[PDB]
């Protein structure tokens, strides 16, 4: 039975499922994001005050790896949570029509900003579109950092390079990756707050985009 | 006002949205009678309380309440008054209230079919006594009519109807009917919001309308 | 003028924006009477002052003040004057000012429902004495009417109304009422401002209207 | 409870939060930008008056590094301040409707200019879009400079290159990076002034995009 | 002609742009009198100078000057002439010129409210003598009226008005009023432009209008 | 006081500030451009008459460096002067509205041609858009020239390359960079002349895009 | 026909583009008289040239020549002919030709203000003798009128007007006025092109119109 | 004085300046292009009838160099001449308005086809846009040729490559560059003829895009 | 004189010039294309039936070179013939107006399909746009083939690569270039046929896009 299949979907992902995400985002998530930003700022100050030599090429800084790992773990959680909201809305997009689409337009508008969150803000895709990648750093933060650092390490370690700027570039990678976490957490917090507002103002039409009342006909 | 592919008149549906913004009003039939109760937005001690009533006498035996665009509603009440007088002059009496309600509803329907005009953003309840008995009708922006034992219009319509659909009994004494009506109206009010002296009017077979004075209304609050 | 999906008439709401740009005016009821006060956007010694009349007599017992599009307002005042005369010829007097205000408002309502015309960009306050007593009404671009103890129109409406909401009391002596009114109007002005001589008119039961001369107005400034 | 969640967002990021940013931008920020521009111009004059040999490849010029660091620090602050303004507006975008959007248009208009500031003017994203990178230099200026300089240094220092143009290029990298800071500070100051004006002219609708007064119905 | 979201009527504002392109003209009251002066964009020795005059008598006691679309202006002057005669036939005289100006202004107001027509692109100054005294009014595309001691219309309005705000004195002798008027008009000309001979007309209480001929106007140049 | 903040901005960049730029553009700027184009043309004629060997890979020609440096200096001045005009207009863009935008359209149109000047004609950005780089040479022409020549020099100097076309390519780089200056100065002159005309025709609405005259009311 | 933001009526300006495509015609006053000359686009030897003339008698004392849409022009000439007869029946004569011209121009003005019609794509020159003397007027698609000593309409207008501004002299004898007019018309044919026999008509005070025949026209070529 | 500044511009670049370009284009320019096409065609004929060996890699063919130089010189002149026409039009674009733009549209249309000539047909920009490079060769074809040939020469000359197809590709570079001149000359002549027609048909509105005659008002 | 310059242009490229091309395309051109297709298939058949070893890297196959050369000559001719049609149309595009453009639209539509033929079908440009290169092989197919083969030859010859797929890739390059000629000839014949039809149906408006009969005025 076709109605049964639709009802099973909708019973499995209800307004409660999406509201629970929003509740968690408004509390613990924003607080965790702020925590990551402060840890990044602390690591950034430490690097700013450091003089680098060849020994800095011989070890990957644990403090920075920890900050990047925490950022990646949070982004993983937010992505999965955003998919829950997406699912709740997308399984309630109604029969396709050329009329009575005021609530459908609300559904598409909120899905658009959740897509922006997942794709642009979190940088979760394999490749960025023609729009580029507006987030300072994307989800796969550790890989990005390790890739950039490893290249400079190989050049410095070997005879190792004698370029003075290349050694400063090693320090700058360390500094810039913490800066990028600081900027990205800030940008993400804006997005998460914007989604909380959009969801809570629009949720009635997100769940029930069309309201029945054929009072004109008998 | 033209048809959508699915056969709907959206300009009429939008007129119905104006109606939902209005203050809640209700009517119910009781033993040998019918009554109307209307909630009011009174917002400022600078307003004259006693004026621009929600319950409007159409003649001594028929009253109306409205919800929606207030100027549109005034025009329709004026129309209903004149139409009732024309019937009385023609035949000497108004035998069946349904025909007056149909004339008003026809005026509304016309404004959904002809270009150059928008529909009236108004729903009305008419209540009174004619040769058939106590009558209670509603009429919406499309000019759709229904006759009822009890009904409501305005923002609180749904809650009032829900309440009456479980609590209403036919042929109650007037006092018990009013009590019930007040209770239904209160049921539609938001959490912690209380009811500020509604309008009440009633008529019984063989009598003319009476409007409840400020003091008689308070006895039910 | 058609309905939006939420049941709104935006062209009427826009007409209401024109009214917000007009000069500030107010009315208030006092012991056995009613008064009007109007501020004036006088700029230039080259203008004739005597010819300015923001307060317009409708008949000897009824006056109006308007805000918004000035030419539109003149047309509605002319309409009100003729309508008042037609009633007086038909019945011999004007028993209830509310009926005149309703005819003016019905004219305005019509221009919100029929295509081919725009609404009037005008709000009016009517004040006078009839058989009920001293009356004070306002009327807006939709043709919505309200009766008031005190009210205001024009750019300073919100400040004047807030002031009156706090400071108004019923049955003041005329002198005290005018004093209150001037203080209310003054409150609506911006950083470090008079307030040149406004127009003041009042009427008390059993008398005709009087227009305060420039020198009697000065006493309150 | 839903209204409470929305009220907590809006209480946390108010018109005062955004105005506080604008006040800072109008005073201290523009002053710091001016200061950096002067420091860049001074550094540029020093390089213009220099002859370069292989010694210039053995040391990274600390004066240039300080100018670039100062610019990056300023960009970081402006980015985070911009996000405060973005948040104040974004959490007050009202219920999605097909009407009564004149104030919403204002919100979108000011968000768009703040987006241009953060994405284009500051060059804060991981990758620029199809519209290119119109700012003379972005946030990660230091990294850009060190990467460009190290390449030339490695080539000059080795089997060290005998290309005469390669040596002049080392100088031109030093010169151009200072020029780019002079140009970017100018360009940035224009955007910041434009945003101050846009905010102060539009702030009422940014906070309250819809104003109630339904007098037509009863 | 409909309202913008800010309550403006852009088609009326655009009509006012057409008025701004017209030749400058001014009016001013003086001791027991009123005068009009009009500049003209005389453009070819091949034109007959004595024809299609800017100052037009409405009757022996009332004259008008216009600025803006010249064909529209002629229609409104024709209307004004006929409306004056209707009033004279009905009552025997024209007691208050303001009522004539209002009738013209109402004709213009109508063309800003009804679809199917555009506004008149015309401003007018009316000047003459009635039972109240020497009168001076202007009227714009919206049908907005003001009464003045001195005023101007057309491209040079702002300069002429600024000059008058400083230099104008009440109750001047005619000759000194004309001199001041000529001075005011000159103050509005662009870098080294020469006033080549305006039209002048004047009226004093108890007399009919006087149109200055070219040779008399020259004595003021 | 918000009005004060706006007034301070507008008092600091007035129509006089932008008019002073246009006056300089109409006179000294176009003259300097002309002088650069003549200098580029003389250098090109010298190179056309030249036969190239290994000695030409051993020295970077100072005459060409001088032409390119002069061109960069001019571009720098024009950029900064353009930003003054941009600032004067941008801080006078009025409250966002859906009406009364005829002067606002003027402001946007003139800002658009100043943006094209800065971004496209001067090539001031760090990455050109999908539109490409229409100007024959951009702001960083000297670095461009040094980069291209250094690559060919290293190839020729070494076991040096035996390719006869590589040696002619060295000459062609020298020739083409001079041709590119001749072309770019011409192109730039047209744009500067177009902006002088556009500013002087539109300046009234640029400063005062809306004129208040609310005569319908009271 | 509505206003652009700059206060222009583009539909009227466009109608004026149609007039610019017409054959050149001119009028000039001379000693006790006025004449009209019209060039013609002769576009096939199969046309009867003796028919559908550019110069049209309105009555024995007044003629017109037109440029622009030929069917529109015919309608206006028909209107002018009937309007002249109405005046003659009402008063016994046509005292001032300007009033006839104004009636035609008013008809054209109306078609620039009312929706549902387009303007006439026509300019006219009227010339004749009335009680004032010899008269020469032009009238354009807006209904703008001017009186002239000499004027032209059609494609060659600017060249003919330039010529006459330099070479025109008042009170020439008829033969010399005609020579001048032929010479003026010839100068508007810029490239080495020949003037074919134009239409010529003239009138002197005390006489009726006369149309120059084929051979008399040739005498000036 | 502002009017003077505009008059000085317009006096210096008049319709005579642009008409003079068009007269030259219609005569000498088209003839020079025709001459280049024939020189290209005969050089192509020579290469076609040639068998290549290692010797052909040891000298760059002077005949091909001369054809390419000639084409470049012609492109140079056409570019500079096109900028004269652009200047004449651009300094006469009138006050920005939302009406009376029929002549303004003519100005933009002719400017568009001259921009196509300069950017696309002549390939004058430093980077082509997303529209690609539709012309068979651009303004820097000599440099293009030398680069391409130098790569193949180096591979052939050395431990030189034994690839038979590499030798044939040396010939094909020679042939294809000549073919590209034949094609580009043809393509350029079409564009030149199209601009001669557009200019001569539209010149009145190009100079005077708005004609006054305010007869309606007094 | 202006009219004379236009008339000389139009007298030199008349409807006869374009019709003559269409007559040639309808007959000999399609026949030659058909000939190339058959010769390509024949060569393809020969390669399909071949086993390749190192010996095939030592010589470039003359039969395949001949087919590719023949295709290039054909494309060269078609390109120049298309430019004749282009010219005939482009020099009769009339005065730019906002009306009476039904004929002008026909001119732009036929120019569009001829442009597609030249740019896309023949692949004549130096760089393909964002629309890619939809033709199986373009005008520089011989150079494409030699390039591709010479890379593989060098790897195979060296010591030589022992990659089995590299050896098969050599054969695949030979086969695929013949396949691409078979496909491109087919695709070209479709375009050519489409253009014959479009020209012959539309030629009257191509020559005379506007037709006079202003009988309405006198």
Swiss-Prot record, chains B, C, E, G:
The N-terminus is blocked. The keyword Cytoplasm applies. This is Proteasome subunit alpha. SMART domains: Proteasome_A_N. Belongs to the peptidase T1A family. HAMAP family: Proteasome_A_A. Its main location: cytoplasm. One of its GO terms (cellular component) is cytoplasm. The gene is psmA. It comes from Thermoplasma acidophilum (strain ATCC 25905 / DSM 1728 / JCM 9062 / NBRC 15155 / AMRC-C165). Component of the proteasome core, a large protease complex with broad specificity involved in protein degradation. The T.acidophilum proteasome is able to cleave oligopeptides after Tyr, Leu, Phe, and to a lesser extent after Glu and Arg. Thus, displays chymotrypsin-like activity and low level of caspase-like and trypsin-like activities. PROSITE patterns: PROTEASOME_ALPHA_1, PROTEASOME_ALPHA_2. Keywords: Cytoplasm, Proteasome. The formation of the proteasomal ATPase PAN-20S proteasome complex, via the docking of the C-termini of PAN into the intersubunit pockets in the alpha-rings, triggers opening of the gate for substrate entry. Interconversion between the open-gate and close-gate conformations leads to a dynamic regulation of the 20S proteasome proteolysis activity. It comes from the Archaea. One of its GO terms (molecular function) is endopeptidase activity. The keyword Lyase does not apply. It is found in: Cytoplasm. Pfam families: Proteasome, Proteasome_A_N. The configuration of the closed gate contains an opening large enough to allow rapid entry of tetrapeptides but able to impede the entry of proteins and longer peptides. The 20S proteasome core is composed of 14 alpha and 14 beta subunits that assemble into four stacked heptameric rings, resulting in a barrel-shaped structure. The two inner rings, each composed of seven catalytic beta subunits, are sandwiched by two outer rings, each composed of seven alpha subunits. The catalytic chamber with the active sites is on the inside of the barrel. Has a gated structure, the ends of the cylinder being occluded by the N-termini of the alpha-subunits. Is capped at one or both ends by the proteasome regulatory ATPase, PAN. GO terms for biological process: proteasomal protein catabolic process; ubiquitin-dependent protein catabolic process.
